[PDB]
Amino acid sequence: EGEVTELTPEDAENPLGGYGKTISHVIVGLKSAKGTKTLRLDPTIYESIQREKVSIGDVIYIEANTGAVK
Amino acid sequence: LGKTIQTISLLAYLACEKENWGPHLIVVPTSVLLNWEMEFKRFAPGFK
């Protein structure tokens, strides 16, 4: 649980090719009093982030096993 | 009982002794027709 800082998808090679742009993780950075970490997350988070419409500088709640975000 | 193989054998007897492979005719229901062709192949594949 953090305010949001970095938000950067990491490109990866496509197993099926097709010249498309693929991501294998979405990267999020989080700041907390006396704390900061950067996380690599299941790409499925993209859909959660879309639904939640997180922007940089928002404080967010994200569940370690569920992949849910608020 | 093998009517059809007996027909083959009769024709083949006409073939060996009588040499008469002349254009014989057989009229038959539609369904068995292909089975007849198969058995001609099986019992005596020399028949056109």
Binding site: - | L1, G2, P29, T30, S31, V32, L33, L34, N35, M38
Partner: protein, 145 residues
């Protein structure tokens, strides 16, 4: 169901095409592995499906139109025959039953006939049976009119 439990391969012969379609619907509803050959099956399709039914034991039931099945399709791969209906032509019935029963048969042959209790079919079967018994006693030459 019982026959499948025993692993038998059963034929059903019927005079009516519409009941053939009904059987299609029934067998699909239960999902039995079945094939159909009738007066409308394409000739090549007839050959290939009979070859499949002889070779491919997996097809539990093969549905044929009774008078077209009479025409001499070799069904010695099957072991069970069921007459869904009758036209009361004894020669046709024997032809159908003989279909399964030719050289190369290796399983004991079971035939079952469906009869509707106390209906017209019941009376017809009763009288036919009685007459047949009488004949068999009197005459054994195996000929009829």
């Amino acid at each position: 169901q019982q026959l499948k439990d025993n692993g038998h391969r059963a034929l059903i012969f019927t005079q009516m095409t519409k009941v053939l379609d009904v059987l299609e619907q029934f067998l699909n509803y239960h999902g039995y592995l079945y094939m159909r050959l009738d007066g409308a099956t394409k000739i090549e399709d007839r050959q290939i499906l009979t070859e499949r039914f002889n070779t491919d034991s997996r097809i539990t039931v093969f549905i044929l139109s009774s008078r077209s099945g009479g025409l001499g399709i070799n069904l010695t791969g099957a072991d069970t025959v069921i007459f869904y209906d009758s036209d009361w032509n004894p020669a046709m019935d024997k032809q159908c039953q003989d279909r399964c029963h030719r050289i190369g048969q290796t399983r004991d042959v079971h035939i079952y006939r469906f009869v509707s209790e106390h209906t017209i079919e019941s009376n017809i079967l009763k009288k036919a049976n009685q007459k047949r018994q009488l004949d068999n006693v009197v005459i054994q030459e195996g000929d009829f009119t």
